[PDB]
Amino acid sequence: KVTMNDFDYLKLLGKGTFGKVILVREKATGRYYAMKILRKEVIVTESRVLQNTRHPFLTALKYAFQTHDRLCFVMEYANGGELFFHLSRERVFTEERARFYGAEIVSALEYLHSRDVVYRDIKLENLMLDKDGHIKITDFGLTPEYLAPEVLEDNDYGRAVDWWGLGVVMYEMMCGRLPFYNQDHERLFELILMEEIRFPRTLSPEAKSLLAGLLKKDPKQRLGGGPSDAKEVMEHRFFLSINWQDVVQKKLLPPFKPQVTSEVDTRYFDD
């Protein structure tokens, strides 16, 4: 049975209206985890559900305990640094690079949607890299919100919004900026809903096909909003060189390899 006293405090990873996430070290194993702490007072789609859903690119929930007035979920912390950090350093990624990350993400969501689970949070901030350069969908915000249009209009969080999530995340990695990075900001509601998303000219006709598909303002017409769900996305022109079995297998070679010795190498824990 884990407990508060089993860990050492390192840093604040994120706060919120739900609670906070802390970086800690299990004193026994010396390992590093991210302790998500929730006020019982404030408050189940994250608990149990996300606790038993294991998967190569989804963050694993190591221990789950509770204090007298808070819920604690100790989770595995990827130490390859967050994508956002990496993307900003390179301004943009190779259409292959995007393709790479996109596929591991697409693998994570095919799995989730199969367990009838809608992620809701596919977005750059929630993306890190493990010590081998593989992607890790983290459960928290380490930025203008880009809620799916059907979320903005009908508060409908169906399977589809994860694809949009993918889409917005993949419009950034390859384009280096959000679809409306310039235009004011209070205009997103109107923009995301009624504004055609423009694509750089320097885009491979397939990538431009993908983005357009992942960003259809109609979930019913979105690439992946089809009754076949992920298949549509796994089978899009942009994803040919894709060996979907190698992905879940952590077989593909990470195109960029974070610079850490062991998972205890705590360098990506600053800025």
Give dist(CA 244, CA 232) in Å, integer: 13
Same domain, 125 and 184: yes
For residue 168, what is the domain's CATH number?
A: 1.10.510.10
Binding residues for ATP: 13-21, 36
Binding residues for Mn(2+): 126, 139
Same domain, 37 and 92: no
Same domain, 264 and 242: no
Binding residues: 13-21, 36, 126, 139
Q: Can you give the residue range of the structural domain that contains 9?
A: 1-81+260-269
Same domain, 165 and 207: yes
Phi and psi at residue 163, in whole multiples of 5°? -70, -45
* Contact assessment for residue 254 and residue 134, using Cβ atoms and an 8 Å cutoff: yes
Query: Residue 161 has which token pair?
Result: 């919004």
* Contact assessment for residue 255 and residue 94, using Cβ atoms and an 8 Å cutoff: yes
SS3 (DSSP) at 149: helix
- As for how many domains the chain has, the answer is 2
Same domain, 54 and 159: no
Give dist(CA 141, CA 123) in Å, integer: 9
Catalytic-role residue among 6, 121, 132, 265: 121
Record the resolution, in angstroms: 2.5
Tell me the one-letter amino acid at 116. D
Same domain, 88 and 205: yes
Same domain, 159 and 99: yes
Give dist(CA 199, CA 202) in Å, integer: 8
Same domain, 165 and 244: yes
φ/ψ region of 114 (left if φ > 0, alpha if ψ in -120 to 50, else beta) reads alpha
Give dist(CA 116, CA 104) in Å, integer: 19
Q: Which residues contact 227 (CB under 8 A, 6 or more apart)?
A: none
Number of Cβ within 10 Å of residue 180's Cβ equals 17
Same domain, 125 and 228: yes
Element (H, E) at 39: strand 32-39
Number of Cβ within 10 Å of residue 190's Cβ equals 11
Active site residue 121: yes
Same domain, 76 and 175: no
Residues found in the chain = 271
* CA distances to 158, 205, 213, 229, 231 from 226, in Å: 12, 22, 11, 5, 9
Same domain, 100 and 69: no
Same domain, 27 and 151: no
Query: Residue 186 has which token pair?
Result: 């209070």
